[PDB]
Amino acid sequence: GGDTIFGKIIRKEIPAKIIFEDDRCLAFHDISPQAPTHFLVIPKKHISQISVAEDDDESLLGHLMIVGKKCAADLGLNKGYRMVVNEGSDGGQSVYHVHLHVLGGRQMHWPPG
Amino acid sequence: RPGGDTIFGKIIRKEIPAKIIFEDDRCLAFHDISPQAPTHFLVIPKKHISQISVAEDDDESLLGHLMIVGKKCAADLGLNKGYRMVVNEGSDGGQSVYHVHLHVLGGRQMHWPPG
Numbered sequence: 247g248g249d250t251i252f253g254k255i256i257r258k259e260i261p262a263k264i265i266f267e268d269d270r271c272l273a274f275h276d277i278s279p280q281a282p283t284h285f286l287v288i289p290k291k292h293i294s295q296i297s298v299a300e301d302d303d304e305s306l307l308g309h310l311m312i313v314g315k316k317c318a319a320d321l322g323l324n325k326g327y328r329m330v331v332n333e334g335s336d337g338g339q340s341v342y343h344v345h346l347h348v349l350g351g352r353q354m355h356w357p358p359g
Numbered sequence: 360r361p362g363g364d365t366i367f368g369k370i371i372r373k374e375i376p377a378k379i380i381f382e383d384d385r386c387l388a389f390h391d392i393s394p395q396a397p398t399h400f401l402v403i404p405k406k407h408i409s410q411i412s413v414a415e416d417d418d419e420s421l422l423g424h425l426m427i428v429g430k431k432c433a434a435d436l437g438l439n440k441g442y443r444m445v446v447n448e449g450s451d452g453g454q455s456v457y458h459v460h461l462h463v464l465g466g467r468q469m470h471w472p473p474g
């Protein structure tokens with residue numbers, strides 16, 4: 247699903263530390279973790295960035311957050327966590343395939359970058 | 360009671376003012392009074408969900424709507440160089456208002472890690 251490294255992960259062409267999968271998304275740990283728990287939830291649909299998401303993608307985007315919530319509980323994050331979507335250059339977006347970050351296991355600080 | 364018992368409930372019921380960017384029957388977007396970036400606003404559901412960790416499976420479309428409204432508002436506010444969306448959950452997330460909400464920050468380079 248796409249011409250990025252996240253497409254290769256979805257297609258199982260390269261290994262990843264997969265947490266959860268269903269028919270429309272994939273959750274895996276970030277290869278460059280910024281917290282004791284740091285994982286990504288990505289749609290299998292190649293949406294390059296949140297700014298081009300369509301109105302019909304609404305439930306899919308919410309699905310990423312519900313999956314992230316459920317994964318966080320099953321990774322032991324009962325003291326809280328932070329969810330992040332980066333858009334474009336100012337947002338620090340690293341891969342042009344929409345992805346939800348979930349970070350926890352330490353105190354997250356303010357501002358969020 | 361509609362909108363909950365937090366400060367965001369008072370905003371939803373229009374009891375206290377806020378600089379509103381967008382409103383529909385499901386959500387409200389308004390500027391943050393303690394901005395951490397040149398543009399910093401919030402998108403919140405009108406339904407009172409205290410935190411993302413207790414959202415129900417049926418809340419999925421509503422949560423996605425917050426993100427769609429967030430990116431449309433970001434475009435309307437001129438954030439063509441990008442932005443960051445954030446949800447804070449619980450103590451480790453730094454949550455202070457226990458009513459689900461999405462931060463949208465832009466107008467400067469955001470740094471990594473995100474706090």
Ligand SMILES: Nc1ncnc2c1ncn2[C@@H]1O[C@H](COP(=O)(O)O)[C@@H](O)[C@H]1O
Pocket residue numbers: 366377390391392393394401447452453454455456457
């Ligand atoms: N009356 C208000 N109007 C606008 N923003 C607010 C108001 N009260 C709190 N906030 C913001 O809501 C956020 C709550 O923190 P958190 O729950 O950690 O996201 C902070 O960014 C506050 O500055």
